[PDB]
Amino acid sequence: VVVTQESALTTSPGETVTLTCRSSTGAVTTSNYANWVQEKPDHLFTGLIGGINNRAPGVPARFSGSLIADKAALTITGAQTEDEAIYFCALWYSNHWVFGGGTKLTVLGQPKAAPSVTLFPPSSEELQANKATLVCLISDFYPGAVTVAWKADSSPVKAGVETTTPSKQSNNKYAASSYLSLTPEQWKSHRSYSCQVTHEGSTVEKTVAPT
Amino acid sequence: EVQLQQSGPELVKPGSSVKISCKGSGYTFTDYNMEWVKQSHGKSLEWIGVINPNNRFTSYNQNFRGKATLTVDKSSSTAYMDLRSLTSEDSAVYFCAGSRWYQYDYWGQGTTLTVSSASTKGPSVFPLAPSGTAALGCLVKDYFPEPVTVSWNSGALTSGVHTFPAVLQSSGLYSLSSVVTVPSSSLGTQTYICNVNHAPSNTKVDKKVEP
């Protein structure tokens, strides 16, 4: 049995957004007792809807449940910035719950901003430890999505890269960090390494050289 | 307030057992069944089973028979789930939840379980030296297990500080970075020290970061 949800939706404050929940067995019925639960950062789950379109205790009136066609639905009217979260549905099948895959709901509560990027070369201390890490600091962007690409001189490098999932700054914009691990040999043997950050509003490339 | 307070994070070797507790307060414990849920890979949710505090009746997801055992102690308002014969497949965040009338009303805070035979490894710390405002930071390399915490100037510095989530690397070790945006005019006359704490290895490092 498989429960299917949209993977991502985007809305804005004050808008109406509708999430849906499909059952692979056929039509969702009120006897599937569709539940909706909300996941926020730091593993914070909150019940929203269950039973038959019943709101959980303390849930704002703007959340409501219904059936739409053969699917269960969660409607958020007048969406708020706080409604950004992952929404999971769960359906009951006589003797067990089955969860959908979740919908990532973005609420654009901020003017879009392309990041400020600072690229740090490996420190001489780390090179003396026979290691090399380039650090690409990606700050003050919105929404919380960027693409990062690394180059050795003018050629792409994919191996040895790890990027953080965007994290919220205290000003509600996002930051992220990307790391390229190299040997000291590799670092000294190219003219330059670059970190290229792509955001909807701008692409910026920063470059560092061992000299 | 309604609280479902779960026991703390667990790091255990393959083949061991763990018992997770979930204590309810601030509601009528016997008005709710206690559901248990596993979240793997930080994404997908599976229902493990449910127990009724009034009569110890239980229902299980057949996939968890012989893995999970649900018990309850009405008098202390605590539900428990024992997980046995642990493998890396059991590494996950586990949740208890209070349900009534086919509705998940209340959620615990989650219990992180890591099944691993890896040994503790303390971090190496390197400066991210600065070269309007300037960015500087500290790079915390190749440690295990989480967490590392970072302050600046023993907590006296917080404006412009962002400590990133760790990355999990191919090696199985973690790395993270902490950065501060400061006035350029303060470079060379203000001391900036990152204080890196890795409690699992009993390690603390202070690194003064200089231009």
Residue numbers in the entry:
A (entry chain B): 22 to 232
B (entry chain A): 25 to 155, 162 to 241
The authors write:
First, we determined the crystal structure of Fab 2C7 alone by molecular replacement (MR). The space group was P1 and there were two copies of the Fab in the asymmetric unit (heavy chains A/C and light chains B/D). We refined the structure at 1.70 Å resolution to a working R factor (R-work) of 0.177 and a free R factor (R-free) of 0.216 with good geometry. The electron density maps were clear and continuous for most of the Fab, including the complementarity-determining region (CDR) loops. There was no electron density (2mFo-DFc) for several loops in the constant region of the heavy chain, including residues 155–160 in both copies A and C, and 216–220 in chain C. A cartoon representation of the Fab structure is shown in Figure 4A. One loop comprising residues 155 to 161 in the heavy chains (A, C) was also disordered in the structure of Fab 2C7 alone. Another loop containing residues 216 to 220 was disordered in one of the heavy chains (C) in the structure of the complex but ordered in that of the Fab alone. Based on a superposition of the Fab with the Fab-peptide complex, the conformation of the Fab did not change substantially upon binding of CP2.
In previous studies, murine monoclonal antibody (mAb) 2C7 was raised against gonococcal lipooligosaccharide (LOS). mAb 2C7 elicits complement-dependent bactericidal activity against gonococci, and its glycan epitope is expressed by almost every clinical isolate. Furthermore, we identified a peptide, cyclic peptide 2 (CP2) that mimicked the 2C7 LOS epitope, elicited bactericidal antibodies in mice, and actively protected in a mouse vaginal colonization model. 2C7 recognizes an LOS epitope that comprises lactose from heptose (Hep) II; lactose from HepI or GlcNAc may also contribute to the 2C7 epitope. In this study, we performed structural analyses of mAb 2C7 and its complex with the CP2 peptide by X-ray crystallography, NMR spectroscopy, and molecular dynamics (MD) simulations.
